[PDB]
From Swiss-Prot:
Active-site residue numbers: 44 (nucleophile), 142 (proton acceptor)
InterPro entries tied to this protein: Beta-lactam/transpept-like, Beta-lactam_cat, Beta-lactam_class-A
Effect of residue 214 to G: Increases catalytic efficiency about 40-fold with respect to ceftazidime and reduces catalytic efficiency about 10-fold with respect to nitrocefin
Amino acids binding a beta-lactam: 44, 47, 79, 104, 106, 209, 211
Family: Belongs to the class-A beta-lactamase family.
Protein name as catalogued: Carbapenem-hydrolyzing beta-lactamase KPC-2
Role summary: Class A beta-lactamase which confers resistance to the beta-lactam antibiotics, including penicillins, cephalosporins and carbapenems. Acts via hydrolysis of the beta-lactam ring. Has penicillin-, cephalosporin- and carbapenem-hydrolyzing activities.
The species this protein was found in: Klebsiella pneumoniae
Highest taxon, organism lineage: Bacteria
Record's miscellaneous remark: Initially two different KPC beta-lactamases were identified from two different Klebsiella (KPC-1 and KPC-2); they were later shown to be identical.
Length: 264
C-alpha cells in the first residue's frame, strides 16, 4: 500500500535513481513489493541462476559437474580471478560454477554459458522453472551495458525472488544439488554490505550480487533463514539515469531492511 511504499520512494529519491524490491515470507506467503514488476539489469546476479541451471542439468546428465573444461588464454575476459589461475590445468564444471557464484568470475560464467548453449540456454532453463520474465541475451562483458530502456539481460525483482525460492527451497533441484547451490550462496563473500547488512548476524544468509559498473545499476538477491522460522526470499535491484551515476551498497542494504521489516 502507501505505507509500505513510502519509505522506498524516499530512499530512491535520496539515491537519485530507481529501486526495485520484492520479498516473500515462505511460511505465511506475506510479501513486500516496490517496483517489483519493473525490469532491472541482472549484471552479475545472473551467475547464481547460471550455477543453478548447471546443477539442474546434472540431474539429467550424470557426471556433468565433474566434466573437465580445459580452455585457452583467449577464453579469459576481464574479472576472471579464479579461472585465470587454472589456465594451465583447466577447471571442472562444478569448480567453474563455484567461481562464478562466489567470485563473480566472468570467464567461468562464459564457459558455463557455452556448456548450456549460450545465453539462450540459460533463458531456456529459467523458462523451464516457470520464469517468463528472466532474459539473458548477451555474454560477459556486454551484458553489463545497462542502457536505459533496454530489456536485454534483465529481470524483475518479483521474478528473481520467485525463481530463487523454487531453486533454493522448492523442488526444482534435487537435495544434493539444492544443498550445493545453497552452500555456494551462503559462502558468497561479495555481499557483506548489501542484503546481509540488513540481517541479524545469527541468521544465515545466502546471496548473489551484481554490479554493472554503469548507470548506478547494482543488485543483490538472497535467502534468509531466521532461526526456527520459515525462510525469506528477497531481491533488491537499482538503476540510475546517468551513465556515471554511482551505485550504492548502502541503498541496497537500506531497501533490504525496509522489505524485511515490512513482512507480515
Ligand atoms: C563484472 C562486473 O560487472 C560485476 C558483475 O558481474 O556484476 C562483477 N561481479 C561483482 C559483484 O558485485 O557481484 C563483482 S565483485 C564485488 C564488488 N567488489 C567486491 C570485492 O570482492 N572487492 C575486492 C571490492 C565484490 C564484479 C564487479
Amino acid at each position: 500500500t502507501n505505507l509500505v511504499a513510502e519509505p522506498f520512494a524516499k530512499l530512491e529519491q535520496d539515491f537519485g535513481g530507481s529501486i526495485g524490491v520484492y520479498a516473500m515470507d515462505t511460511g505465511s506467503g506475506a510479501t513486500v513489493s516496490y517496483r517489483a514488476e519493473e525490469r532491472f539489469p541482472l549484471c552479475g546476479s545472473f551467475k547464481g541462476f547460471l550455477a543453478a541451471a548447471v546443477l539442474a542439468r546434472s540431474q539429467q546428465q550424470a557426471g556433468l559437474l565433474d566434466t573437465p573444461i580445459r580452455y585457452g588464454k583467449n577464453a579469459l575476459v576481464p574479472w576472471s580471478p579464479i579461472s585465470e589461475k587454472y589456465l594451465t590445468t583447466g577447471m571442472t564444471v562444478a569448480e567453474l560454477s563455484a567461481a562464478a557464484v562466489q567470485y563473480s568470475d566472468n570467464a567461468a560464467a562464459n564457459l558455463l554459458l557455452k556448456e548450456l548453449g549460450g545465453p539462450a540456454g540459460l533463458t531456456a532453463f529459467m523458462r523451464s522453472i516457470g520464469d517468463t520474465t528472466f532474459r539473458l541475451d548477451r555474454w560477459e562483458l556486454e551484458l553489463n551495458s545497462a542502457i536505459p530502456g533496454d530489456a536485454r539481460d534483465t529481470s524483475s525483482p518479483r521474478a528473481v525472488t520467485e525463481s530463487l525460492q523454487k531453486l533454493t527451497l522448492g523442488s526444482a533441484l534435487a537435495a544434493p544439488q539444492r544443498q550445493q547451490f545453497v552452500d555456494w550462496l551462503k559462502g558468497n563473500p561479495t555481499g557483506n554490505h548489501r542484503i546481509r547488512a540488513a540481517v541479524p548476524a545469527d541468521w544465515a544468509v545466502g546471496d548473489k550480487t551484481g554490479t554493472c559498473g554503469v548507470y548506478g545499476t547494482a543488485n543483490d538477491y538472497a535467502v534468509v533463514w531466521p532461526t526456527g522460522r520459515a525462510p525469506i526470499v528477497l531481491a533488491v535491484y537499482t538503476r540510475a539515469p546517468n551513465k556515471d551515476d554511482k551505485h550504492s551498497e548502502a541503498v541496497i542494504a537500506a531497501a533490504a531492511r525496509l522489505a524485511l521489516e515490512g513482512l507480515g
